[PDB]
Design a protein around this ligand. Structure first.
Ligand SMILES: [Zn+2]
Ligand SMILES: [Zn+2]
Ligand SMILES: [Zn+2]
Lengths: 124, 115, 46, 67, 260
């Protein structure tokens, strides 16, 4: 059973161990009570420049809301971020994949709208 | 290997007190309530109810470690009042609020199912 | 005492004693599997 | 290998929807419309049904250990 | 210095969810109610399995874990049953547990779907939700000809703090201040964000004018039930459980104050 110290990775070089596990009432939630399965730190993105992670998260939100499988083939001019954002704005979501989350401990809104969505993770 | 049983977050160990009151010596009329086997669910409501008391000068809580299963609530009141009395009144007020909310939710359910 | 085994190919319940070559009596297959114990193992559905 | 019982995120039951989902797909529903017919409105449960790989059907191609 | 006088307004009540609004309460009370929906509303769930025979392609812990997550109707029985901690019996008794039995064998050529309908209980009140008298039955395992699954489960009383299988909710939507009047969020581009379903704003207006004297009131809830409890039973049991947590805390508080 996964636990603190088990190594997980996305498909973009973003590896890390489980720091802690919070129950569903302790995790942050959207207005429709969706809690993240995983929370990763924003500081893993900028130096690494794994923008594929973010585009995959956004495409995955579109895919899950649309009922399809996203096409992430490398060199495809028929798929860019603006198209994916326009598609996501049609399902009642912020076009860039952000959502207002609430603090699970206090229930107050988090001032900064969080970037959340489906991403394929791997257990190593 | 090192996984604590899931009941240890809710269940008191033998000889472990649910709540302990310790006088805070830094300032007068302040107390620390160390409550075992509770979490943000009761800490947040108790703190926020204590903040509604004008005789409460400080009301805060913390979970010192998420892996541990206790909270500490610090309460400072005015000299004519007591932090123990403030904490008691906060719990009484929360209980009355929840009783009223429960009765009103029962009434609302009855109205909704009936018409 | 019997230590009945199952055949990997014919799935036959057959008894084999110690100091006996591991051979199924129905088809001669050389790989056998032990049967599930009768001991009582408990699972917390978690 | 088999359809999970609950949605990992919310805890909605999805175990009873895999067979209905497949029946809707062979009924010429799109995956989105099929997921709408089963009442999976949060994209977490849509993730559960839409990304499931029924490997148990391949594990049932092997004869069991006992006849 | 005293309690709130919250009011309630239920805007939708089905067998699947309850959508309501609590007004004139603190945000901490609203979020503790929300948390208790998930983590301190007890229900009945399988928490003990004994596999007598399993020739299926899923190992024993897989089946056990899978059985634990089947919701069992807990409406009137959960209040009566005791925690096995509190029961004065041996490992089990009908006062703290419910016995289930499952015995399936695939003899026919088509795949046999061992579903929650095959979980036979000794208690008629505590049964799998899908088996209750549409939605299909939860699938426990598919069996091939010659495969067999025979087990004996016991269901216990617990809540979501111990394991998510005792969580009665299939999602708790919680919201407040749909128009960002308290500015607890700060949208870099407020025009880009969709409107809440509870918003009361004309489409040209993106968010409400900032309310400096405002406090969170009017919390909107949508409590979806996994099946074990009715949604309104989840809310009522949540309020009762939170009130008994506070009552026990006050009892222990009184003992600590008087002992000093
Ligand atoms: Zn043989
Ligand atoms: Zn879900
Ligand atoms: Zn008992």
């Amino acid at each position: 059973i996964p636990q603190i110290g088990d190594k997980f990775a996305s498909r973009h070089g973003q590896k890390g161990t489980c720091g802690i596990q919070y129950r569903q009432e302790d995790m942050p939630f959207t207005c429709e009570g969706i809690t993240p399965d995983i929370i990763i730190n924003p500081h893993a993105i900028p130096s690494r420049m794994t923008i594929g992670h973010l585009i995959e998260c956004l495409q995955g939100k579109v895919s899950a809301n649309k009922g399809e499988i996203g096409d992430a083939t490398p060199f495809n001019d028929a798929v860019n971020v603006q198209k994916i954002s326009n598609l996501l704005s049609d399902y009642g979501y912020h076009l860039r994949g952000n959502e207002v989350l609430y603090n699970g401990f206090t229930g107050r809104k988090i001032t900064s709208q969080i970037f959340i969505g489906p991403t394929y993770y791997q257990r190593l | 290997m090192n996984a604590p049983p899931a009941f240890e977050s809710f269940l008191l160990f033998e000889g472990e007190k649910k709540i302990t009151i310790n006088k805070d010596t830094k300032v007068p009329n302040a107390c620390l309530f160390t409550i075992n086997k509770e979490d943000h669910t009761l800490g947040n409501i108790i703190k926020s109810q204590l903040l509604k008391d004008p005789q409460v000068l400080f009301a805060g809580y913390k979970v010192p470690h998420p892996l541990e299963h206790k909270i500490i609530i610090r309460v400072q009141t005015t000299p004519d009042y007591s932090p123990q009395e403030a904490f008691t009144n906060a719990i009484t007020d929360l209980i009355s609020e929840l009783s009223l909310l429960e009765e009103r939710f029962r009434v609302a359910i009855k109205d909704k199912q009936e018409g | 005492q019997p230590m009945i085994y199952i055949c990997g190919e014919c799935h036959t319940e057959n008894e084999i004693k110690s100091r006996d070559p591991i051979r199924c009596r129905e088809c001669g297959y050389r790989i056998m599997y032990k049967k599930r114990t009768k001991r009582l193992v408990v699972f917390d559905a978690r | 290998m088999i359809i999970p019982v609950r949605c990992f995120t919310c805890g909605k039951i999805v175990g009873n929807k895999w067979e209905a989902y497949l029946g809707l797909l062979q009924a010429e529903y799109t995956e989105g419309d099929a997921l709408d017919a089963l009442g999976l409105k949060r994209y977490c449960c849509r993730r559960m049904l839409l990304a499931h790989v029924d490997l148990i059907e391949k594990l049932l191609n092997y004869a069991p250990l006992e006849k | 210095p005293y309690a709130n006088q919250p009011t309630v307004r239920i805007t939708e009540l089905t067998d699947e969810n309850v959508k309501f609004i609590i007004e004139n309460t603190d945000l901490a009370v609203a979020n503790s109610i929300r948390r208790v929906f998930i983590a301190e509303v007890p229900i009945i769930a399988i928490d003990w399995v004994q596999i007598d025979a399993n020739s299926s392609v899923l190992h024993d812990e897989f089946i056990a874990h899978r059985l634990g997550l089947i919701p069992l109707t807990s409406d009137d029985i959960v209040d009566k049953l005791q925690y096995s901690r509190d029961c004065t019996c041996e490992e089990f008794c009908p006062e703290c547990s419910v016995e289930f039995t499952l015995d399936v064998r695939c003899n026919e050529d088509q795949t046999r779907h061992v579903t929650s309908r095959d979980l036979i209980s000794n208690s008629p009140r505590v049964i799998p939700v899908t088996s209750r008298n549409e939605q299909d039955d939860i699938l426990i395992v598919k069996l091939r000809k010659g495969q067999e699954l025979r087990l004996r489960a016991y269901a216990k009383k617990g809540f979501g703090k111990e394991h998510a299988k005792w969580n009665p909710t299939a999602g708790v939507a919680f919201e407040y201040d749909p128009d960002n009047a308290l500015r607890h969020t700060v949208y870099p581009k407020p025009e880009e964000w969709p409107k809440s379903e509870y918003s009361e704003l004309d489409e040209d207006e993106s968010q409400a004018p900032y309310d400096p004297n405002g406090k969170p009131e009017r919390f909107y809830y949508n409590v979806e039930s996994c099946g074990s409890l009715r949604p309104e039973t989840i809310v009522l049991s949540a309020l009762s459980g939170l009130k008994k947590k506070l009552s026990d805390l006050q009892t222990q508080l009184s003992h600590e104050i008087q002992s000093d």
